[PDB]
Symmetry: C4
Subunit: 388 residues, 4 copies
C-alpha cells in the first residue's frame, strides 16, 4: 500500500541463529533441481524467498556439463520458497540474464537482469513484473551488478553497477530507481578504487554497501548511500581483520582509504554490518580458497584501523566449501529494530571438485539474535562420490 | 472489471531486449517437460504466460516418437508461467485440440481450440474457462486458426480462421466474438490470395494481422481489422524485404496487391509491426530453411514497394534452428504507449535433426526498447547428442 | 454465497464437443502419474476438476503390481485440474477409501468416501473439507456408492448407496444430506431390482440417476429423485437400445419395469440423459467387453419400449478400450439451460492387457452442442509395448 | 481475526474413522518423496496439514543412506497438504532443525525448531513465518520438544521442552508463548520423574499432555496445563493398561504418582484422551517393538489404578510396523464439541528392516466418531523387496 521507509536501527547482534537452508545439492542428486549460482535472499511484505541465477539445466542433466562458466544465454534470475530447493517445478523466473539484483519497495518488486555478450551487455529493469527501463553498457566490458538484494527508501532503490575491467580501473555507477525509472545516476566517488558485487542493508534512512575490490584490495570497500539526497561516499573497512578471499594474513593495522595489498585480481562477494560496537564481519576461514565461513564481531571495524575480534561464530568449517555471501533483512517484521541477516553460498563441483563436470551450490542463511546462542556448522552435506 | 480498449500507439522501437526464454529442451533432457509446438505468449491484466500446443507426452517419454505429426487426439492448448518450461506439473490446459488462439478482453480470457479429423473438424470457444460456442468446419479441410494471441477492443475479439486447401484457394473467415459469442463473421476481402496463421496486434482502435500465404506468396499478407465497425481489408507487405520461408532472394521491388512468386506451397508463421517509419519485420535468416531470425527496420514496409533496411538486430544466428514467430503486447502495462513484443519458436528434432524420433521446441521472446541496446543471439541451447 | 437451485432445463443436444482429456497413461509412461480408476468430473462455482480413486502408487512404480484389485487401504478419492493428469504433485486428496461421490451445493463441497473390509465398511461424509458424519455398513457386504458426482438442490444433496450382494438382492438406500448431515434416508422403491453406481444430473428441481443393475438387467435402472419432497421412484429404461455391458443383442422391444435378461452378474457404470425427444444414451460398442463408446439419440427412451436411434456419435472406436462412464454438468455456467456433459474412463492394463501387471485409465470428457458437429474418436493413445 | 479459545468439551468417542493417509513410502518408491520422521498433523482455521522432520534427501536418493540418525544439519520441519506425500515439490519448510512443534492460535501459526550440536542446541520460535524469539540450551544435552502440535488458548500457547539426560534426571520446562514471545516459564512440577515428547490437546480451557517417561516409566506421564493462570501439574496414567513401548505385561494395578517399572531407558511418543468414561488410550500391540497399534477405551484411566478396557479398535496389525503417535484436533470445525484425532507414524527401514540403508515413514490418521464403526487395519503398504 505505502512505500517502505528505513525508520529503524539494527538490533543488537549477540549471535546468529539458523534462518534457512535448502540442501539443494543433496536433494538434487535424485530430483529435478536446477543448477544455480550467485544466490541471495530477499523479502517481500508477506514472504521471504531464495533468489539465484539458474543455469538452465538440472544438475543430473547432461547439460550441467560446462556450468562453471558464468555467462550464457541459458541463465535467468529465479526465485523460490524459503528453504525449498530451486526445482524446475517450484521456481519462478524473475527475468533473463547472468547478473542481477532485486528488491521490494513496500508496494512491489523491482528486479534487474543483465544479459548479452561481454562487449554489448544491457540491463533490463522490471517493476511489478513488467519491463520498464533498459540501460546499455557504457564501458563495453561485462556490465554487472550486485548479485544480492538492493534496498529501498520511500520508493527510491539505489543499485550499484560496474562496467569495465575486473583487473584494473572500471566505471562504477549508482543508479537511483523509482518505480523502475531512473531518477538519477552518479559515477562512483570517495576512495574505493574498484567495486564489484555490493551487499547492501538499510537502517535509519541510510543504505550501507560492503563490496569486493577485485583489482587491488583484500580489505573491502564500503559505499554509504543517502537515498533521500541521492548522494553517496566510499571508503574501505579500516580493520586489519581482512575479509576478501584470497587474502594475505591479518596485519595489526589496516587501511581506511586505500586497498590493503598482497593479493591482486581476485576476490569474492561478501558483506558486513557496520554499526559501531555492534559491528560484525563475514569471511571465509581460508585465506587461500573459498572454504569455511565465520562471523567476527569487530567493534568499529569501519573507522578503527587497529580493531580486532571480541567475539565470533563459526558458520561453515574450514573443511567445507563456501562461496559468495550477502546481506538481507526483513524490513517488514514487527518490532523496534531491524534484524540483520545473511546467506552464504556453498559452492560444489568445479573447479575444486573436478571429478564432476558441473558447478552448483546450496544456501545457508542466518539472522541475528540478542541471545548468546550456541553455534553449529552448516555444510552443504552432499557426497560428490554419489554423483560419479 | 472493464473491457480493455486499444487507446495507445506503439512505442518507438529502437531495438529489442530479452523478455523471456524457457530453455525447455535443455531442461527437458532430464525433467518432465511436455513435448510442444506452435507456441505463443499472451497477457492477462496481472500476468503474462507462455502458451503452446502439447503433444500429450514428455520428451523423454517413449510416446515422443512420432510427434512430428501436427494433429492428433493427444494435443491440447496449454499455458504456463513466463520463462518456466511446460512441464507436466506446472501446465494448465486451456482446451483440447490441434490449432488455437487465445486472448484476454480486460475482464476474462477467451481461448479457442480446434480438433477433429481433417474433413470434420470443429472449433470450441471457451470464455471464462467454460465452453460457450462451437463452429463446424465449412470447407471440410483442416479448419485452422492463428496459433498466436488474438486482440480485443471493448469486448470484441476478432479471430481469423482458414478452412480449405493449404496449396490452392481456401475459405478464410473473420469471426467477431464477444464474451465467446459470435457477433458477426465475414469472408476474407481485399487482395490477399491465401491466409494462414495470423499474428495480430492492436493500437489506436485498429487490429493489424501479419499472416502466411502458404499458396503463392513469399511476401506476407496483412489484414487490418476495425473492431468497432467489425470490418476489414487485406493486402501484402509491399516491401522487397521478403519475410516468409522458404523464399527467393530479395528483389529491388515488391508487390502490394499480389503474391511475390518464386516459392509455392510452403511457408512459416511470422509477424511484423507496421507503423510508418517505426516499422519492423521479422524473418528467418535462411531463405531455404527455418534457421536464424532477425529483425529489420524497414520504414513504410507496408506501403513502399522499394523500402529496404535502415537498422536491424540478430535474434538467432543462422547456425541455430528457428520456427514460428508471432506478436503479442502487454496491453495492461503502465505508460503512454504499447510496447511491441514477439516470440520465436526454436524447433528441435525432426525433420532437420532426425537422429531423434521427436520434434519439440523452446521459446525466446523479446520486447522493444527506446534505447539502442546491444544485441546477443538466443539459441535453444540443447545438444541433440545428449538425447541419443 | 447461496445454495444452488436446479432452475434450468437441458439444452438441446445436437451433438457433443470435446471438453477434456488427460492423456494420463501416455504421459505417465515417463512421469509421476498416479495409478487410478473410477474417475469422474465435478464442478465448483469457479472450477471444474477431475476426480478419481488413486491406488496409492505411480504407474511406473513397482507398487502398481496388483492394482487390478478394487479395494485396499492405499486408495483415496483425489482431484486435480481439468485435463491435467493425476500426478503425485498436483493431486489433492478429498478423503480416504475405495468408493466415492462428491458434489458442490453452491456454498461448498461434500465428498463421501467408503473404506473398510468387505463386511465392516463405513462411509465418512466430508463437508467443507472436514469430516461431519459417518455411516456404518447395514448389510455387511461392500457398502458402496455412485463413483460419480452427486447433485444438490437448495442444500439437499441425495446420494445413492448399495450394501449387499452384487449377484442377488441387496439393500439400496437414498440418503438426503444437507451440510453433510443426514436429513432423511429411504430404502429403494419402484421397480428397479438391483442398483449400483448411479450417474446423476439435475434439471428443473428433479434429479435423474441412471444406474447399473449388476444382478439381472442389461437395460439400465433409472431413479428419479425429488430433492424438495425428498422422495423418489425407480424403473428401467424402456428402450430396446440396451446400454449395459456385457449385454445381449438389441431386441425390438424392451422392458419398463423389469430387467431385460440374457446376462447375469455383470455390468458397467454408465449414464444417460432422459429428456423426451432430447434423450441420449451412452454405451460401449461391444456387447461383450468394455470397448468402444457411442452416444445414441433415442427419443423417449425412458418411456417408449420400441424407441430406436435417430442420430448418434462415435466417441471411442470399437478397437480401443473404454470403461465406466458418467454424467456431470456445470450448474454455474451462464445461459438459459444446463449443458449436458459426460466422461468415459479408458481402462488400460489388466485384465485385457495382461502383459503389464497394472490397471489404470485415462479420461475423455464431452459436452453437448446445439450445433451438428463433426465427430472424431478419442482413444487413450498409449502403447502397452512401451511399458514392457 | 480473533484468538481461538478452548470453549468446547470432547465429543463422545464410540470409535475412530479414517482421516488421512499418505502412502508415502509406496509412492516414494518411484517419485521424489522426502525422507522423513517424527510426523504430526496440525490444523489452521482453513486447512489441516501434515507436518514432519525432513532428512534433506529423497528416499531413492543415495543421501538416504544414514537417515536412521536423528539429528543433522540437513533436517527441517516441513508441512504439506493432508494425505499427499511429502515431496520435494509440494513441501513447505516451516523452519530448520531436528526437533519441533507447531500450532495456530486463531490468528497465525507459531512453529518451533531446535537445532545444534548435542551440547549447544538452541530453539528458534517463529510466528507469522518470521523468527521472533530464541532460547539457548540450559542443560547442554539435546534440548528437545514435543514433536507434535501445541495448543493455544487466547493467544497463550504452552510448549514443553526437555534438556538433559534421556536416561536419568533432566530439566523439563514449560514455556508460555504469546505471539512468539515468552510470557513465562516454569520448571516441571508434580510427580512425573521424566518427560519427553508431549502429545497435547485442549478442551474447556485446559490443556492435557500425554508424554513419554524415557527413564523409568512404562505408564505415561501426564501434564495438565491451565493456560489462563499459566500453571500446571503432573502425574502418571493410573491405569494398568500400560501404553509405552517397550513395556512389561499389563498388571492388575498401576501407579498414579510413580513410574511403573520393568523397562528402563527407552520408550516411544504416544498419546491419550483422558475424559472420564470417554477415555481412550493408544499403544503398540507388541510389548517388545514398535509394531501394531490399538485404541482401547479405559474408563477413568487417569484416576483409577485398576481400570481395564471396555472397548477397542485395531489401527495397525501386530505384523506391521508402527512408531510415534500423537494427538491433534481441528479446533475450528463447526459443532458443539471437539473431535478427538490422532496420527500414527509407520516407520519403515532401519533398524528393523536393515536390507535398506534408510529409515523413513508414512502416516495414518484417525478421528473419533459417535457411531460404532467397523474397523480395518491401516499398514504402510510398501514392499521393502522393491527397494532392493
Ligand atoms: C557453544 O556456543 C558458543 C557460541 O558459539 C561457543 O562460544 C564461542 O566460542 C567461539 C570459539 O571459541 C568464540 O569465538 C572466538 O571468539 C574470539 C574472541 O574471543 C576472545 O577475545 C576477547 C578479547 O581479547 C582482547 O581483549 C581482551 C580483554 O578484553 C584481552 O584479554 C585479549 O588479550 C585481547 O587483546 C575476549 O573478550 C574473549 O573472552 C570472553 O569469552 C570467552 C569465551 O570464548 C570466556 O572464556 C572469557 O572468560 C571471556 O568472558 C575471548 O578471549 C575470536 O578471537 C576467535 O576468532 C579468532 O580465532 C578463530 C580461530 O578459532 C579464527 O578462525 C578467527 O579468524 C580469529 O582468529 C584469527 O584472526 C585474528 C584477527 O586478525 C587473529 O588474531 C588470529 O591470529 C587469527 O588469524 C589467523 O587465522 C585467520 C583465519 O584463518 C587468518 O585470516 C589470519 O590470516 C591468521 O592466519 C573466535 O571467533 C565465541 O566468541 C564464543 N562465544 C561466546 C558467546 O562465548 C562455545 O565454545 C560453544 N560451547 C561448546 C561447549 O562447544
Ligand atoms: C552492439 O550491438 C549493436 C546493436 O545490435 C550492433 O550494432 C548493430 O549492428 C547490426 C549488424 O551490423 C546492424 O544491423 C544491420 O543494419 C543494417 C542497416 O544498417 C545500414 O544501412 C543504413 C542505410 O543504408 C541506405 O541508406 C544510407 C544512407 O542513409 C546509404 O548510405 C546506403 O548506401 C543505403 O542505401 C545506414 O543508415 C546504416 O549506417 C549507420 O549505422 C552504422 C552501424 O551499423 C554506423 O556505422 C553508421 O556510421 C551509421 O550511423 C547502416 O550502414 C542492415 O542492412 C543489416 O541487414 C542486412 O544484412 C544482414 C547481414 O548482416 C542480413 O542478414 C539482413 O538480411 C540484411 O541484408 C540482406 O537483406 C537486404 C535487403 O533486401 C539486402 O540488401 C542484403 O543484400 C541482404 O540480402 C541477402 O541476405 C538475406 C538474408 O539472408 C536474404 O534474404 C537475401 O535473399 C540476400 O541473400 C543489419 O540488420 C544494426 O543496425 C546495428 N545497430 C545499431 C544500433 O547500430 C553492434 O555491432 C554491436 N557491437 C559490437 C561491438 O558487436
Ligand atoms: C462428420 O460428422 C458427422 C457427425 O458425427 C457424421 O455424421 C454422423 O454419422 C454417424 C455415423 O453414420 C451417424 O450416426 C448414426 O446415426 C444412425 C441414425 O441415423 C439414421 O436413422 C434415422 C431414422 O431411421 C428410422 O426412421 C427413418 C425415417 O425417419 C427411416 O427411414 C428408417 O428406416 C428408420 O426406421 C434417419 O433419420 C437418419 O437419416 C438422416 O441423416 C443421414 C446421415 O447419417 C442423412 O444421410 C439422411 O439423408 C437423413 O437426413 C439416418 O439414416 C444410427 O442408427 C447409427 O447407430 C447405429 O449404427 C452404429 C453402427 O455404425 C452402431 O454402432 C449403433 O449401435 C447403431 O446400430 C446398432 O443399434 C441399433 C439399435 O438397436 C440396431 O438397429 C443396429 O442393428 C445396430 O445393432 C448392432 O450393433 C450394436 C452396437 O454394436 C449392438 O449393441 C447390437 O446388439 C447389434 O449387434 C449411428 O449412430 C450420425 O447420426 C451422423 N450425424 C449427423 C449429424 O448426420 C459424418 O459421417 C461425418 N462426416 C464424414 C465425412 O466422416
Ligand atoms: C466390525 O467392527 C467392529 C468394530 O471394530 C468389531 O467389533 C469390535 O471388536 C473388537 C475386537 O474384538 C473389540 O475390541 C476388543 O474389545 C475388548 C473389550 O470388550 C470386552 O470387554 C467388556 C467388559 O469386560 C469386563 O466387564 C464385563 C461386563 O461389563 C465382564 O463380563 C468381563 O468379564 C470384564 O471384567 C465387555 O463389555 C465387552 O462385551 C460387549 O461387546 C461384545 C463385542 O466385542 C459383544 O459380544 C458383547 O455381547 C457385549 O455387548 C467385551 O467382552 C478389549 O478387551 C479387547 O482388547 C484386548 O484384547 C486385544 C486382543 O484382541 C489386545 O490386543 C488388547 O491389548 C486387549 O487385551 C490385552 O490387554 C488387556 C488389559 O490389560 C489384558 O486383559 C489382556 O490380557 C491383553 O493383554 C495382553 O496383550 C497385550 C497387548 O499385546 C499386552 O500389552 C499385555 O501385556 C498382555 O500380553 C479389544 O479391544 C471391540 O470393542 C468391538 N467393538 C464393538 C463396537 O463391538 C467387529 O468384530 C467387526 N466385525 C467383524 C465381523 O469383523
Ligand atoms: C574444503 C577444503 O577441504 N578446503 C581446504 C582447507 O580445508 C584447507 F586445508 C586449505 F589448506 C586452505 O586453503 O586453508 O586448503 C583448502 C583447499 O582444499 C585447497 C585447494 O586450498
Ligand atoms: C541450423 C543450420 O545449421 N542451418 C543451415 C544453415 O546454417 C545454412 F548453412 C543453410 F545452408 C541455409 O539453408 O542457409 O542450411 C541450413 C540447413 O542445415 C540446410 C538443411 O538447409
Ligand atoms: C479393444 C479391442 O480390441 N476390443 C475387441 C473388439 O475390437 C472386438 F473385436 C471384440 F470382438 C468384441 O468384443 O466385439 O472383442 C474385443 C476384445 O478384444 C475381446 C477380448 O472381446
Ligand atoms: Ca580483492
Ligand atoms: Ca509462402
Ligand atoms: Ca447388468
Ligand atoms: Ca518408558
Amino acid at each position: 500500500r505505502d512505500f517502505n521507509n528505513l525508520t529503524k536501527g539494527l538490533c543488537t547482534i549477540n549471535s546468529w541463529h539458523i534462518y534457512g537452508k535448502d540442501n539443494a545439492v543433496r536433494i538434487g542428486e535424485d530430483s529435478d533441481v536446477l543448477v544455480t549460482r550467485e544466490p541471495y535472499v530477499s523479502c517481500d511484505p508477506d514472504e521471504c524467498r531464495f533468489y539465484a541465477l539458474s543455469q538452465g539445466t538440472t544438475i543430473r542433466g547432461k547439460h550441467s556439463n560446462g556450468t562453471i562458466h558464468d555467462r550464457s544465454q541459458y541463465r535467468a534470475l529465479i526465485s523460490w520458497p524459503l528453504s525449498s530447493p530451486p526445482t524446475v517445478y517450484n521456481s519462478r523466473v524473475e527475468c533473463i540474464g547472468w547478473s542481477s539484483t532485486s528488491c521490494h519497495d513496500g508496494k512491489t518488486r523491482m528486479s534487474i537482469c543483465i544479459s548479452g555478450p561481454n562487449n554489448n551487455a544491457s540491463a533490463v529493469i522490471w517493476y511489478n513484473r513488467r519491463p520498464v527501463t533498459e540501460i546499455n553498457t557504457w564501458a563495453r566490458n561485462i556490465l554487472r551488478t550486485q548479485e544480492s538484494e538492493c534496498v529501498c527508501h520511500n520508493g527510491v532503490c539505489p543499485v550499484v553497477f560496474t562496467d569495465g575491467s575486473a583487473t584494473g580501473p572500471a566505471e562504477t555507477r549508482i543508479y537511483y530507481f523509482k518505480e523502475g525509472k531512473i531518477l538519477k545516476w552518479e559515477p562512483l566517488a570517495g576512495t574505493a578504487k574498484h567495486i564489484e558485487e555490493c551487499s547492501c542493508y538499510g537502517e535509519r534512512a541510510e543504505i550501507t554497501c560492503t563490496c569486493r575490490d577485485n583489482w587491488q584490495g583484500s580489505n573491502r570497500p564500503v559505499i554509504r548511500i543517502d537515498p533521500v539526497a541521492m548522494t553517496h561516499t566510499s571508503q574501505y573497512i579500516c580493520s586489519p581483520v581482512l575479509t576478501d578471499n584470497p587474502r594475505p594474513n591479518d596485519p595489526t593495522v589496516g587501511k581506511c582509504n586505500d586497498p590493503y595489498p598482497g593479493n591482486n585480481n581476485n576476490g569474492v562477494k561478501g558483506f558486513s554490518y557496520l554499526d559501531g560496537v555492534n559491528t560484525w564481519l563475514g569471511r571465509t576461514i581460508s585465506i587461500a580458497s573459498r572454504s569455511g565461513y565465520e562471523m567476527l564481531k569487530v567493534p568499529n571495524a569501519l573507522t578503527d584501523d587497529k580493531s580486532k575480534p571480541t567475539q565470533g561464530q563459526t558458520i561453515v568449517l574450514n573443511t567445507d566449501w563456501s562461496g559468495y555471501s550477502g546481506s538481507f533483512m526483513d524490513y517488514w517484521a514487527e518490532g523496534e529494530c531491524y534484524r540483520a541477516c545473511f546467506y552464504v553460498e556453498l559452492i560444489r563441483g568445479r573447479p575444486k571438485e573436478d571429478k564432476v563436470w558441473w558447478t552448483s551450490n546450496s544456501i545457508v542463511s542466518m539472522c541475528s539474535s540478542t541471545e548468546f546462542l550456541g553455534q553449529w556448522d552448516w555444510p552443504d552435506g552432499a557426497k560428490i562420490e554419489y554423483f560419479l
